[PDB]
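Fold this sequence, please.
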Amino acid sequence: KIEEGKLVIWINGDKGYNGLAEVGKKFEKDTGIKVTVEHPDKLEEKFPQVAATGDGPDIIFWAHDRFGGYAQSGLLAEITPDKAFQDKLYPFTWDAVRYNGKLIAYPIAVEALSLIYNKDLLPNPPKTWEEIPALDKELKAKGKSALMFNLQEPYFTWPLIAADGGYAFKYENGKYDIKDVGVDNAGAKAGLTFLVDLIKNKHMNADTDYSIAEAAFNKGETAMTINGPRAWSNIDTSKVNYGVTVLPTFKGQPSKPFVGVLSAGINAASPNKELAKEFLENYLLTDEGLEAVNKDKPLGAVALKSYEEELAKDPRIAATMENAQKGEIMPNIPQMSAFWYAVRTAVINAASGRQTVDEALKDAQTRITK
């Protein structure tokens, strides 16, 4: 079982665990309670196993979407922040950590795709998707293209498909309706049709994947790309003069990227729930706590309003948050696995003309509501 009188934390190795350890030393300094930060391999797979037998960490950090399944098995304790604490974070981040009306984690950081552009090839980035075909024509006249991004993964193409009314599952009051899916409505067909037109008209290649898009942008061959905070590091080494901005609108509607919220959940089997609540609310979720983590490895945009206002002095963070506020929180329900699979197939089939847009989306919708 889990030991009383200490805190064990699991967080992924690509996060600022040395910075989190420093927040834990301040907590120990104040309380005498020792905090241990670990970053085990495949911790998101291990957690459900060890937590099922009342073991594991007191606190686990992960993207909010995995927590729906954890909470389904009763592996997470319901949290109880007061209204005053809740107000210190962006309201939309709390929606990401509700499972069947219960708050099951604390929101830490927010991730969403943004439009990344080469300031040298483009003085001002396009504000709409519709003007991209013409812009590509101007740039092709000089051996460059307008836009290259990963078309193989629905995570990347979804912002455009959803822009005019598409949605994964309907959400109402901390709950999703698994029978109300917006994959084959008029808005989703409009968006995927637009995407297919870009491919037919040779403004983009259907086989463009993550590594192809990144290489082209970082080599200066394409004016724009669509990517998240994790990409900036390779661009910075490439020394391309880039900007990060709000995604283009489609049909006058904002692009709707999926929002991922890094969250901290408390093991239901933990005998240290009060200690975990004190650590999270009063040590980690402060400007000083988040700064310590961020200084180790940047979090991106954060759910804490006060610290986010300081971070947003960096335009790339500001844009990340702006796209997140216009985005679609990623559903934390198990049915999302049917969605990823079906939509990946629908997009690839419609892109290669194997199937028409109507038929590909019709099939996906059926398959997801099955």
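The chain has two domains: 5-111+260-331, 112-259+332-370. The two ends are 40 Å apart (CA to CA).
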